[PDB]
């Protein structure tokens, strides 16, 4: 159920079949232009999980705080790191990782062998503004926006970092610290 492939790939061996191009047109010029761009993008990132998150209300430098921690890590390790960081940007990176993995599964890749192979940001459209200063001077007041792109590939070169895991506090009927026998510590 993949989108059609209209040309040969650049891989050493071909894994799919090229299909004939459509012979019908869209009603309006605007629609035709938009759909041609969509067709071009569908020729890319085959056999890999990709995600493109648009118009995140953050800046490039704020996003790079989180992204620099997950590059070249296994998907399982990268996902955990994004959860523990108490930053507003970490929420958007976590959504992108989940969206990309769902994309990989639809293409038929094994989620247990995925590695974060490429991550980068891109500038969006800015909201300009002005703020007054003292003695009649004025300054800038700009709200920034950024795009995020994540690519997941199988059996790519990965870093050896691994995090230790511990259980949380035990609360409820599963806690049995009250059964401790303290009579032993009085002996020699």
């Amino acid at each position: 159920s993949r989108p059609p492939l209209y040309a040969r790939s650049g891989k050493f061996r071909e894994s799919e079949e090229v299909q004939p191009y459509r012979t019908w047109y869209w009603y309006d010029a605007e629609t035709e232009s938009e759909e041609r761009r969509k067709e071009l993008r569908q020729q890319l990132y085959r056999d890999s999980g990709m995600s493109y998150y648009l118009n995140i209300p953050q800046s490039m430098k704020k996003l790079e705080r989180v992204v620099r921690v997950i590059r070249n890590l296994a998907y399982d390790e990268a996902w955990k790191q994004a959860c523990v960081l108490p930053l507003k940007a970490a929420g958007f990176v976590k959504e992108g990782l989940e969206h990309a993995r769902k994309d990989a599964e639809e293409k038929g890749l094994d989620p247990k062998k995925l590695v974060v192979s490429t991550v980068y940001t891109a500038k969006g459209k800015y909201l300009r503004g002005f703020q007054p200063m003292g003695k009649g001077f004025a300054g800038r007041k700009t709200t920034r926006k950024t795009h995020l792109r994540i690519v997941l590939r199988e059996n790519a070169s990965v870093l050896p970092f691994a995090a230790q895991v511990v259980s949380p506090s035990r609360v409820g009927g599963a806690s049995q610290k009250h059964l401790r026998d303290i009579s032993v510590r009085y002996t020699v």
Binding site: K38, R41, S51, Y52, Y53, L54, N55, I56, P57, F92, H99
Partner: peptide, 24 residues
């Protein structure tokens, strides 16, 4: 806290448009 009633519709449209979303 004192937004105009004559531009309520346009504020709503801007709020919907300016939301993050995934491409295709």
């Amino acid at each position: 806290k004192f937004q105009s009633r004559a531009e309520k519709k346009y504020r709503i449209m801007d709020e919907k448009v300016g939301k993050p979303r995934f491409q295709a």
